[PDB]
C-alpha cells in the first residue's frame, strides 16, 4: 500500500520549533521525493519544500532559512523542522510524493494532513455533556472547552454512522473550542439501544465515553 | 513566482449538469499543470496531471484541457459526491504554486429543516454554565434564521452557530445554534424556545421546553 502519514506534536509555542515526521509505505525514499505543503484554515494550499530521491532539497524562498528536511531511509521517514513558529503558521501540514529528482515529475499521493496550532495557551481536554432526546428522535453530545483542535467523535465505537452529524468546532472568546455531535435514531430504540459518544482528544491523551440517556 | 489565477471562486450546480473551472498561468508553464480535488476535512486528491492526463481510478467525467496559458477542468455530468474545493497546481518551476481554489456546491431542491431542542444537562449545570442547543437537520439551502426567545424575550449576543458540510448522498446541511447562559440567568426563566425561519417552511417553526 502506497501511503504517507504525518505525525508530530501539534501544539507549538510562539518562537519555538515545529518537528513533523512523514512516514511512508509502499515505496522507497531513494526512488521518490517528498513535498511539504501547508494550508491555513479556510485558505489555499501553499508549497513549502521538497526533498528528492537523491537528497537534494528545494525550498520556498521566503521560508527557506526556517526550513530543514532530513531523511531516514531505513525508517521510511522524512522529517520537516520549521523554526521560529508564529501564529500565522497555524495550518494543516501535508506531505506528498513525487517520483525521482526533478520538479517536472508530478506529485501524486498525499498524506492525511496534520493540524498544527501555534499558541502560547496550554492544552486542555474536553468536557463531554449529554444532549438528551414523528418517529425520529435526536440525541447528541456537547464537547466543550478543549484546546487545541482536533477532537474526534464516534458513536458506539463506530457501529453508529448513519445519521451522525459532527459539527465544526467553534472557537469561543475564551480561546477554547466547543462542538456538538448529534445523531437521529428511531424513537422506538430510546429505551433499549445504548448510545455512547466516544470522544478522543489526542493532543491531551484524553478519551471519554459518555452514555446519552433519554432523561 | 508564477501566479495561477483560478476562476470562478464558487460554483453551485445540479446533479447531471456540466461545470467548467479555469486556471490562467502568469507565465508559460508548458503543460505542467495538475488538478486536485479536496473534500472537506480531507487531503487533496489527484485528478489530472500534465494538464490533460486523467489519473488511474478517476471517473471519466473529469477531463482537462489547455488553450495556451488557459487551463480548463470540466466535470461532464456532476454527481452528489463531487462537492469539493478544486485547485490547480503548476509544477514547471519553484516555488510550486496553487490556484486559490473553486468551491463547488451541489445544487438541489429546497428542503425544510427538522428542528430539535436540547436542554442543558444536570452535569453541565453543576459546572456553573448552561448551554441550550437547537438543531436544524437535513435542509437546503444553508440560509436560515434561528432566534432564541427566553420567556418570550428575544436574545442577542449570546448564541453561536455551526453548519455541517453537504451530505454526500442527499446534498443537505445541518445547523446547530447554541445559546449559552450563566446558571444564574438560566434559573431566572422558564420557557426556552428557538424559532427557525427557512424558505422551505411555509411559516416559522418553534421548539420549546420548560426548565425542569
Ligand atoms: K500529529
Ligand atoms: K525508505
Ligand atoms: K502555459
Ligand atoms: K523556468
Ligand atoms: K425547489
Ligand atoms: K420540525
Ligand atoms: K430528521
Ligand atoms: K425535540
Ligand atoms: K458555542
Ligand atoms: K423565507
Q: Which ligand is nearest to the CA of B27?
A: 3
Helix (H, G, I), strand (E, B) or coil at B183: helix
Which residues on chain A are in Cβ contact (under 8 Å) with B162? 167-170, 179-180
Distance CA B73, CA A23 (A): 32
Correct CATH for A127-211 of 3.40.50.2300, 2.60.40.10, 3.10.20.440, 1.10.10.10: 2.60.40.10
Query: Domain residues of chain A, as ranges?
Result: 3-118, 127-211
- For the CA of B116, the nearest ligand: 8
CB atoms A108 and B55 under 8 Å: yes
SS3 content of chain A, % helix, strand, coil (to 5): 10, 50, 40
Domains A3-118 and A127-211 share a fold: yes
Strands B10-14 and B102-107: parallel
Give the chain A residue whose CA is nearest to the CA of B40. A42
Task: State in words which class domain A3-118 has.
Answer: mainly beta
Chain A contact present for B2, CB below 8 A: no
From B82, B135, B59, select the one nearest A139 (Cα to Cα). Answer: B135
Q: What is the resolution of this structure in A?
A: 1.7
Q: What three-state secondary structure class fits B167? A: coil
Q: Identify all chain B residues contacting A136, using CB atoms and an 8 Å cutoff.
A: 114
Q: Is the CB of residue B125 less than 8 Å away from at least one CB of chain A?
A: no
SS3 annotation, B20-78: EEEEEECCCCCCCEEEEEECCCCCCEEEEECCCEECCCCCCCEEEEECCCEEEEEECCC
Largest CA distance in chain B: 69
Cβ(A95)–Cβ(A6) under 8 Å?
yes
Q: Flag if B118 and A112 touch (Cβ within 8 Å).
A: no
Grid coordinates representing A151?
A: 477532537
Distance CA A27, CA A4 (A): 10
Cα separation, B209 vs A132, in Å, equals: 12
Domains (range + CATH), chain B: 4-107 (2.60.40.10), 114-210 (2.60.40.10)
Q: Is any Cβ of chain A less than 8 angstroms from the Cβ of B209?
A: no
Closest CA to A201 of A158, A154, A156: A154
For residues A126 and A144, the answer to whether their CB atoms sit within 8 Å is yes
Amino acid at each position: 500500500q502506497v501511503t504517507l502519514k504525518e505525525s508530530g506534536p501539534v501544539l507549538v509555542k510562539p518562537t519555538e520549533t515545529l518537528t513533523l515526521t512523514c512516514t511512508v509505505s509502499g515505496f522507497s525514499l531513494t526512488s521518490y521525493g517528498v513535498h511539504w505543503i501547508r494550508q491555513p484554515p479556510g485558505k489555499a494550499l501553499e508549497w513549502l519544500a521538497v526533498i528528492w530521491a537523491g537528497g537534494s532539497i528545494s525550498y520556498s524562498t521566503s521560508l527557506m532559512s526556517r526550513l530543514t528536511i532530513s531523511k531516514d531511509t531505513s525508517k521510511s521517514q522524512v522529517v520537516l523542522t520549521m523554526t521560529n513558529m508564529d501564529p500565522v503558521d497555524t495550518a494543516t501540514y501535508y506531505c506528498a510524493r513525487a517520483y525521482g529528482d526533478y520538479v517536472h515529475y508530478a506529485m501524486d499521493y498525499w498524506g492525511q494532513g496534520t493540524l498544527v496550532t501555534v499558541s502560547s495557551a496550554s492544552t486542555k481536554g474536553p468536557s463531554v455533556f449529554p444532549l438528551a432526546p414523528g418517529g425520529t428522535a435526536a440525541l447528541g453530545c456537547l464537547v466543550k472547552d478543549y484546546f487545541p483542535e482536533p477532537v474526534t467523535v464516534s458513536w458506539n465505537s463506530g457501529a453508529l454512522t448513519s445519521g451522525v452529524h459532527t459539527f465544526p468546532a467553534v472557537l469561543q472568546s475564551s480561546g477554547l473550542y466547543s462542538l456538538s455531535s448529534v445523531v437521529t435514531v428511531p424513537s422506538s430504540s430510546l429505551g433499549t439501544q445504548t448510545y455512547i459518544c466516544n470522544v478522543n482528544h489526542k493532543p491531551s491523551n484524553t478519551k471519554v465515553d459518555k452514555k446519552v440517556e433519554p432523561k | 513566482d508564477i501566479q495561477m489565477t483560478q476562476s470562478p471562486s464558487s460554483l453551485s450546480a445540479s446533479v447531471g449538469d456540466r461545470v467548467t473551472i479555469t486556471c490562467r498561468a502568469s507565465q508559460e508553464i508548458s503543460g505542467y499543470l495538475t488538478w486536485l480535488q479536496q473534500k472537506p476535512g480531507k487531503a487533496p486528491k489527484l485528478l489530472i496531471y500534465a494538464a490533460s492526463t486523467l489519473d488511474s481510478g478517476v471517473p471519466k467525467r473529469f477531463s482537462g484541457s489547455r488553450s495556451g496559458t488557459d487551463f480548463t477542468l470540466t466535470i461532464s455530468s456532476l454527481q452528489p459526491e463531487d462537492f469539493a474545493t478544486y485547485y490547480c497546481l503548476q509544477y514547471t518551476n519553484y516555488p510550486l504554486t496553487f490556484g486559490q481554489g473553486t468551491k463547488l456546491e451541489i445544487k438541489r431542491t429546497v428542503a425544510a429543516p427538522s428542528v430539535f431542542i436540547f436542554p442543558p444537562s444536570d452535569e453541565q449545570l453543576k459546572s456553573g454554565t448552561a448551554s441550550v442547543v437547537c438543531l436544524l437537520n437535513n435542509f437546503y439551502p444553508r440560509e436560515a434564521k434561528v432566534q432564541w426567545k427566553v420567556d418570550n424575550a428575544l436574545q442577542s449576543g449570546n448564541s453561536q452557530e455551526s453548519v455541517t458540510e453537504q451530505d454526500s448522498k442527499d446534498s443537505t446541511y445541518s445547523l446547530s445554534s447554541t445559546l449559552t447562559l450563566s446558571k444564574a440567568d438560566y434559573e431566572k426563566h422558564k420557557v426556552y424556545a428557538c424559532e427557525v425561519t427557512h424558505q422551505g417552511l411555509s411559516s416559522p417553526v418553534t421548539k420549546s421546553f420548560n426548565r425542569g
